[PDB]
């Protein structure tokens, strides 16, 4: 189905961020994914302090990866994100656009 990967990456310089993004997308493709688009939400202060890989983070880069993947890929990809040291936090959700916007007639 269609999934969205919300990625909070280590606050790094441009070459390292580019390498990390390429590595993540390559993992997605290796797991059978068709990557649709990559969106950069920007570098920002984290809402709270996040401890990952024996390091404390207060700032991070927010990215979105839209893709289509088989259902078996997701779990595998999750494990991969657990091992990547440049990933503060990764989450794969069902793509919000795929969710249907049922119409409402108002308050009864």
């Amino acid at each position: 189905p269609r999934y969205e990967l919300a990625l909070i990456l280590k606050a790094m310089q441009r070459p390292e961020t580019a390498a990390t993004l390429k590595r993540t997308i390559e993992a997605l493709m290796d797991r059978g994914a068709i990557v649709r688009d990559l969106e950069n939400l920007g570098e920002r202060a984290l809402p709270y302090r996040i401890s990952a890989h024996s390091q404390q983070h207060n700032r991070g880069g927010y990215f979105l990866v839209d893709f289509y993947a088989p259902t078996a890929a997701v779990e595998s990809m999750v494990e991969h994100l657990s091992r990547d040291i440049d990933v503060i936090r990764g989450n794969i959700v069902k793509h919000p656009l795929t969710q249907e916007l049922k119409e409402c007639e108002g308050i009864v």
Binding site: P47, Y48, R49, I50
Partner: protein
């Protein structure tokens, strides 16, 4: 513990009015339910007792709202008698 400090539940003082700021903080903590949470968490409330209490409070609020609406609707008739004598 992991959040930024001096933003949550923080009040600034205006022209050295410390008491007004403290009372505003008390108002905020009560309106957000934090005071009630802290007081209720001193001892364990059993799930059945919790359910009964919430049911009672919901029904009491509904009943009070309906009674208030009834009185406000019937207060319109409360005026000076227009047919005095007859």
């Amino acid at each position: 513990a992991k959040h930024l400090k001096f933003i949550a539940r923080t009040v600034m003082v205006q022209e050295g009015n410390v008491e007004s700021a403290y009372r505003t903080l008390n108002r905020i903590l009560t309106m957000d339910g934090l005071i009630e949470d802290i007081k209720h968490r001193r001892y364990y409330e059993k799930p059945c007792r919790r359910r009964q209490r919430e049911s009672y409070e919901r029904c009491r609020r509904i009943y009070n709202m309906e009674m208030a609406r009834k009185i406000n609707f019937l207060m319109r008739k409360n005026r000076a008698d227009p047919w005095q004598g007859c």
